[PDB]
Amino acid sequence: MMVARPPKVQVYSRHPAENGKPNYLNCYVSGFHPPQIEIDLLKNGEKMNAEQSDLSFSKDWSFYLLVHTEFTPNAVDQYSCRVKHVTLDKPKIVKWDRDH
């Protein structure tokens, strides 16, 4: 079976962001198949230590995962989420911004 569904990626904070205030950074990856995937939160381009949810799926059978960790936003550091999957000919990178 040749089905291969590309992932949707959202990068966002738990609470509205404010500089110098401890918060949580989330990378939600959904709608994908097959289930093999690599999801990395990045800080200034380097992998962060992050926790990953147990594999689950939706009514259409497609899979989803949450990758998350603590962070304290500021005006200097850059954050993003990098995803690798059979449907992606180069990694998908989504930048975090406080307006989405």
Binding site: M1, V3, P34, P35, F57, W61, F63, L66, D99
Partner: protein, 277 residues
């Protein structure tokens, strides 16, 4: 607050010339995950993933653990059987999934139930609404339908859904009442983001809500603006609640002509909001 449900989600994946398949199970009451099983864990067991299930004694953990170890073996057999039905080689990874559950009526008895199976991200076989019959998605699944009819497997499902399933659901709802029987309404606000002389983005946010079901829409004096509205997928907050937003581009100076409308089961009335700096 709508009818409560108990549901389970199983996934097995084949890893060829690389060992036996992996089996993961998760259990939910409504949108709250309360248990997990992972065939790769040392002495793998059904584990708690919510605080209110820890109360349950050792007899509950042992029984739930044994059932998941048997499922893992059954799904390994299923993956083998499916290669024969679809004439597939030994070379590729394949996926076998199940999702099933029950809903509780206002009378404290079964309202409705379901039991579905999927192979390689496609429908395979499903229990019908009447809990007395099956729907096969293709000619391979028809083989399974004939086998399960011969075994009257539907009767075994119906007796579970009516009895043990709703028995467990009532127990979980009482044990975790402080969280499971409480809808958390959304905290809402509207942000504005300039873009060009032709448009300004207005974004309507809904934060910290439970359960996940919600309605977010924009209107311009009575008429829905869904056509070119950006509506992101409902996403987890990380603490058990959910988030969502809906955005549209409007001409500069006409921001007060647009209103955001929010419906959720935790709200006594629907909400209306606007850009209000």
């Amino acid at each position: 607050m709508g009818p409560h449900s108990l549901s389970y989600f199983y996934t097995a994946v084949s890893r060829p010339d690389r060992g036996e398949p992996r089996f993961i199970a998760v259990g939910y009451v409504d949108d709250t995950q309360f248990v997990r099983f992972d065939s790769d864990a040392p002495n793998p067991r059904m584990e708690p993933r919510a605080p209110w299930i820890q109360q349950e004694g050792q007899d509950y953990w042992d029984r739930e653990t044994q059932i998941q170890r048997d499922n893992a073996q059954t799904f390994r057999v299923n993956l083998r059987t499916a290669l024969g039905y679809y004439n597939q080689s030994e070379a590729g990874s394949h996926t076998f999934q199940s999702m099933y559950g029950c809903y509780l009526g206002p009378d404290g008895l079964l309202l409705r139930g379901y039991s579905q199976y999927g192979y390689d991200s496609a429908d395979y076989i499903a229990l019908n609404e009447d809990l007395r019959s099956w729907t096969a998605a293709d000619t391979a699944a028809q083989i399974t339908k004939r086998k399960w009819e011969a075994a009257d497997e539907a009767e075994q499902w119906r007796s579970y859904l009516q009895g043990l399933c709703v028995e467990g659901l009532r127990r979980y709802l009482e044990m975790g009442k402080d969280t499971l029987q409480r809808a958390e309404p959304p905290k809402t606000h509207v942000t504005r983001h300039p873009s060009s002389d032709l448009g300004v983005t207005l974004r309507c946010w809904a934060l910290g809500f439970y359960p996940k079901e919600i309605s977010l829409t924009w209107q311009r004096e009575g008429q829905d603006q869904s056509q070119d509205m950006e509506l992101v997928e409902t996403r987890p907050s990380g603490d058990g609640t959910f988030q969502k937003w809906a955005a549209l581009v409007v001409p500069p100076g006409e921001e007060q002509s647009y209103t955001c409308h929010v419906q959720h089961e935790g709200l006594q009335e629907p909400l209306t909001l606007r850009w209000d700096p």
